Amino acid sequence: GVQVETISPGDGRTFPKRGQTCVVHYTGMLEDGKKFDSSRDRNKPFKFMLGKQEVIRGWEEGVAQMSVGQRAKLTISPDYAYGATGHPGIIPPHATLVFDVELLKLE
Amino acid sequence: ACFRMTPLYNLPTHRACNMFLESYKAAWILTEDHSFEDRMIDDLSKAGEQEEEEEEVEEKKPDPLHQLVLHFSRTALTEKSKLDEDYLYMAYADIMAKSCHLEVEVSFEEKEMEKQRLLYQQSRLHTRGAAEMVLQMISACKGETGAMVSSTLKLGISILNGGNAEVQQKMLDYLKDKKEVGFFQSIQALMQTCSVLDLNAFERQNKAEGLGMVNEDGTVINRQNGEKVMADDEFTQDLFRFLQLLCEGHNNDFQNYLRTQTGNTTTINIIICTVDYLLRLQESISDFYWYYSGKDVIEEQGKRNFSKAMSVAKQVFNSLTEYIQGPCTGNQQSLAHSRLWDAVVGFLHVFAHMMMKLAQDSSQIELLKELLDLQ
Amino acid sequence: LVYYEGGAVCTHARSLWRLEPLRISWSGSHLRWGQPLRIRHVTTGRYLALTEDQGLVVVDACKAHTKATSFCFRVSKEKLDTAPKRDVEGMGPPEIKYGESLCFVQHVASGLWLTYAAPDPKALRLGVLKKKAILHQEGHMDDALFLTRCQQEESQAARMIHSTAGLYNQFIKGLDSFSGKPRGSGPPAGPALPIEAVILSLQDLIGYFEPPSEELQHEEKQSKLRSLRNRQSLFQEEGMLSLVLNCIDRLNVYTTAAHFAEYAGEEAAESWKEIVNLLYELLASLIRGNRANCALFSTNLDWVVSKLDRLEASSGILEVLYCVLIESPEVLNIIQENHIKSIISLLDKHGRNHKVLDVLCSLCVCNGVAVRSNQDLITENLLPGRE
Amino acid sequence: MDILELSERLDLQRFHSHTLRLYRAVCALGNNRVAHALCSHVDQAQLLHALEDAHLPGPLRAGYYDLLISIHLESACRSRRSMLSEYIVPLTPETRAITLFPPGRKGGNARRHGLPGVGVTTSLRPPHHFSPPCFVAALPAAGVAEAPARLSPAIPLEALRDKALRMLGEAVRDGGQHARDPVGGSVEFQFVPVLKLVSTLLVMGIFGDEDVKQILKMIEPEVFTEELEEGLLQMKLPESVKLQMCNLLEYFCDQELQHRVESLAAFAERYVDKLQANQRSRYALLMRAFTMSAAETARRTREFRSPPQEQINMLLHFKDEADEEDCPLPEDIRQDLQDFHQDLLAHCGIQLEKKPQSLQELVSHMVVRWAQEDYVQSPELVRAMFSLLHRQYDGLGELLRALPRAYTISPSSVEDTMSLLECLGQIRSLLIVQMGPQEENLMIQSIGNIMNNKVFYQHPNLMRALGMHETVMEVMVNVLGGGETKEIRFPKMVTSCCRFLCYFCRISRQNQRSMFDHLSYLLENSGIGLGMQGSTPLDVAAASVIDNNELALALQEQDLEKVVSYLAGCGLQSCPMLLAKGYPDIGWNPCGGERYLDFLRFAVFVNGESVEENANVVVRLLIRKPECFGPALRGEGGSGLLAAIEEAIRISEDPARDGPGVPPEENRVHLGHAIMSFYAALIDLLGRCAPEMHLIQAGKGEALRIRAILRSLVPLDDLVGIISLPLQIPTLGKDGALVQPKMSASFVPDHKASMVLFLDRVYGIENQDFLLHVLDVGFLPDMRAAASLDTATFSTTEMALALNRYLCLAVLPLITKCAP
């Protein structure tokens, strides 16, 4: 349930594989247009490693399809995010999440 | 265990340091004398260079000492179920109390100088609402014993020493205009909670001291934890000392007010309440005599408990004497129709038999001297 | 029935009695030993009496015929029987003192003495410290009674409770007259409701329970607060708080004044909105700042919450809820999700009112202790919507 | 719309200001999970922007400053502030270098005071823990109340502290300019929000030495110089700002107090080494004293035959100059302590000019000047300034009251102590929150971690100083306080706290005495503790007096009267919990009564002897309320002790009268067994109240009277009848399965053991004929039954083990006494 729509092209050659740390800058909004999270506000890039289930499964496939330097828009269905339980106080249940993710680098 | 006691140099450093801190504070910090109450009260009693205008500002906003008393008077008048413990009030009540007394042929001239110097130190407080604060704090405790009421009573005694008529007038005026019953209800409740000689408590202590307990970390030599026989004897003495000072100098108005409060909706006879405690104290002393009546010699612990009981009995007798002197005819009639005669009869029985018993050994001559002046 | 009871009853209004001598002129003169007099219960208006059926009871004024209700105070139980003393035209000599004189209450007609019933054993386990008061020919040695003065504030409040209870009970039974009887195109077919009396009584009580102004000095403000708390407790212990709730409930079964007009007529319906607002205003005053009164809603909280959507008294009911939550920690422990959703729904339906936010703030922390369940429910049901 | 438009739109300004208040309410008092949620609504960038926005309305500016503290700093500051009252100083090389005054050449008695809050502090403080606010991480698979507790959201502290310093510095200059448009609309709205942020960061310890120096310059640039720029103290601020200034000065006064404690601890480490080295050398030469001395060597070795606390008391007894003979220290060692004592008094400003030249003189002058310049109207400010003033005048007394919370530890135990402090901080955080399923798990694991820590057992005094037992007790009573009669919830938390306190008492007598001070507090909460099973507050009260004669003799009569009143109630009403479970309604509560009986058993019987002071009181209290003896022994209309036990056996054998008749409930209560257990406990209590033999032989009147009363209550024939009652024996049959009795629902040898104790202590066996009569009906059948059970199958059965305990503790010791 992840759809990846490109915003700005990357290198198109290097892609993140399993066990590699991904450094991304993201801004997450509900699909109706309400923002709820953004790494830009904290002014600190978000780091995570693929395959360790550190993030929601929607980010697992979405970032894997992106290249280094690419900025893309990921639309994640409720099943590939928090879903029925949701995130209490942040994300309502059965909410589709839209993310503007830029893959800064891999480490 | 004495021959296998561990020497200090075999202890770990951290354990020895902890023992050093306890020893150092008891022998060097506690023993240190630092008198700052007089200096602190003097500093707070000064108005700070505001006399360059001398306009109709003659309202004369309170000085720092006056504002301190008003603050404590504010929390005493607050409508609360219980007067919560306040270390700040206790600390300042002791400071104010310690700044008022500051005390072999004293001449007439300096005898009056000491009285006037005493009056001036008391004047620094009762002219800033301290007299009213003492009454409010006593009414606020609602008859619950503790450090708060004990500190208040000591402060009240400090400003009433020598029979300060000006403080007595301020206290009497405040009680009569407010017409509150809480003050005497609190006083009556406190007097009913005053302890007397308890033989059951005394018997328990004798067995406890015979065990010879020790602690784990080291060894304590017969730890001297709080006495459980007339533990609040000092509180009882100051409670009746405070009542005596209200009538000191033959203050007939205050003597009548203790017997009856005309303006209040309910009346509590403090004069009768004093006799009630005297009967309980007398009965305890009589029971104590019977305990040692069979025994040939009164041991050290018994003599010490006798001494503190006699000291309390002296204060109660002095308080009763101050009630009726002047003379106060109303208080004399109240005592005549009270159970005071029963207490006096009981004391005479104890006095007669103790005098005969104590005179049979010179080791108890000091106790006999205390008994004689009690009579 | 009359009992000898101790504890908190010694400061309540149901232990207050009025001594009424058998005359009008100089009825306020000094009481004398052996002087006949009636004893009246202030809050209920009934008179101590001796009946051939139940013995010692309190009867209504229509049954106090100077024979069952005549009592006298005697200094001793000795049968003096000297002579009937003749009353004087003046205050007379003072004989009986407050709190010093020991008085034996004797029924004049029968000569019986007021005493206790010597409660049967096996009843002490029930916690019944009450001893039933009876009239007996012999009595006991400790039958003497102390007469203690009552403050003017308590005496006035007890009489007000007597008058307030009678008026609202009349108002309540008037509402029940047409509870399910539509008037149709005619009169309500019953006695007129005391609309003007109820409105004036409510306004007087609201001003009677008004909190002291914050501009007063600390000393007199605390004195007024102490008196206010005492008067709130006195009314609550006599069922005035429950009496107000009954008036609200019977008036709350009508959705609007026009609906109320279908049963009480137009002349009574034009004051329907005014009365309900005053009832909630009085209810808030009876509990504002009184934790004991606010704790009573820990059993009936849906009563307040379910009325939040009422349009006639939206502001008054919200004030009642606010007073309860800021005083009683017990109510915060019974708050459920449906209660919070109802309060949040008040923002959605009544607009952005900052008082509703204050109500939600009071649900989280009370007296320095936080409730995690309330904090999570408010966060879950209010924040993620972002509406 | 621009948020700055709210300066004229007052309707939205009030609503939004109260919205920020609601944000603080939902995350208040350690609700870190909600605090993370709030970061999605008010992000870090918005908060930082709001701090520097000079056009924000006052209510909004104050609200956003408080919102930032609540979300990010409130939890850390509160936890840190609780630890600031204790001084756990490890004996590390950093601690050794700590001195009262900086190295200088001003004066030998005292150099100039250093800057408060500047220097090296070695007191243990657990570090702050924060988590990054992230809303894309996978939701934990861990269920609610089982996942680890959430930490506070993380915000860059180094950047935040620089902004707070810069904003405060700008405000001081701006306040000097007397601008007609202060930030926030007033001077109060310009300084109070900034000062709250600076005060919060100071308590958390975020500022370094250089940062603290800058703060001191802003407070008072003339006093706080080490070797229009007007300070805050002279800017004539309103009372609200003055309250925040007192908080700042309170922190620096605390740092001076902490410095004195650490310096005193530092000197102790150095001085103890000299004391230990000198005492070792003195003992070495003292072993050769016989060649030049005589019997008075005992006087010289008196030190080494004394407890170490007494040894160090004698060594330090050289202050008054009248005790220079008993102290064996050389004069050079004595001088070092006197040198430190002089500079300690000087550092407290005891003894040894418009410029204060020190924090103590600055604060005292400032408070007096404030009070004499205007009539202060804020009661909070008045208390704050006079509390601060009292500390300056009494510095030695302030140090004296802080020493009991000071404790030195080995550097090798720092990591375990830090772990213990972390667990204690979690427990202390539960004093401000209603107990719930999540908090219950945190409380249980925190107690388990503490009881798994070696420091908890090695340093009982440190645990007592930290008030660990008080904190656990307060948490327990809050749960017991709510629902005190209808139902007790979170039972696992209650039994965890009670078990913790029971082990706390058994560590040392001082811990046991500390819990004894709350004996009345525990008893008043023990009325409903019968409902919970396992470890109860009544068990904690019993554990605080067990095997301690000093505490047993100190037991007040009111506490015993309270227990007997509870016991009387159990003898007159059925258990409400049992009735709600379908149990038959017998007119008393044997289960509840037994629990109170065993508490009195520990109060009257200590170390194998009866405490006559407690025994006499309990017996007199029991007879004044005869319903404490149960429906039997009632006097009129009451069956005897033997009849009651026989009736209980018939109840046990018959269902629909022993239980609900719907273990089945895993703790199923059997009324037949419960009735026997009550009387067995009652007979055991009365037996232990019997006077000792030496008192009876001495002919004491009180002892004889008590024994006569006990004999009247329990006849001798009933004791023999109960002992003679048959016991069900595990047999074999029906293919060879063992037919065993259920020990929780039948007559057990433990019931007989109580009867034997009463018979021995109260009646005794004095004649041969009675001894033979007891053997062949009561003892020998039980001895044969145990012997027959010593086979391959029946040896390990529960009944056989119970018989062995009964014989080896009650019967056989009695027969050994009666051997002649």
Numbering used by the authors:
A (entry chain F): 1 to 107
B (entry chain A): 3634 to 3736, 3749 to 4020
C (entry chain A): 244 to 630
D (entry chain A): 1648 to 1874, 1922 to 2046, 2088 to 2397, 2410 to 2567
What does the paper say about this structure?
pmcRyanodine receptors (RyRs) are intracellular calcium channels involved in the excitation–contraction coupling in muscle cells and in calcium signaling in neurons and other cell types. Mechanistically, caffeine stabilizes the C-terminal domain (CTD) which is responsible for transducing the Ca2+ binding signal to the S6 pore helix, leading to gating. Here, using cryo-EM, we explore multiple xanthine derivatives and related compounds and identify 4-oxopyrimidine/2-pyridone as the minimal motif necessary for binding to the xanthine/caffeine binding site in RyRs.
Caffeine interacts with RyR1–Trp4716 by pi–pi stacking in a hydrophobic pocket formed also by residues RyR1–Phe3753 and RyR1–Ile4996, as described by cryo-EM. We observed that caffeine is as expected pi stacked between RyR1–Trp4716 and RyR1–Ile4996 and interacts with the backbone carbonyl of RyR1–Glu4239 through a bridge water molecule (through carbonyl C6=O) but does not engage RyR1–Tyr5014 (the N1 is methylated). Interestingly, the position of caffeine is flipped compared to that of xanthine, suggesting a flexible binding site adaptable to chemical substitutions. The small size of xanthine and caffeine molecules in addition to the hydration shell is probably what in the past had hindered the determination of the coordination of caffeine, and now with better processing power and resolution, we can be certain of the binding mode of both xanthine and caffeine. Moreover, engagement of RyR2–Glu4194 and RyR1–Glu4239 suggests that stabilization of the thumb and forefinger domain (TaF) adds another layer of signal transduction. Recent advances in cryo-EM hardware and software allowed us now to routinely achieve 2 to 3 Å resolution and to confidently determine the mode of binding of caffeine to RyR1, xanthine to RyR2, and other related compounds to RyR1.
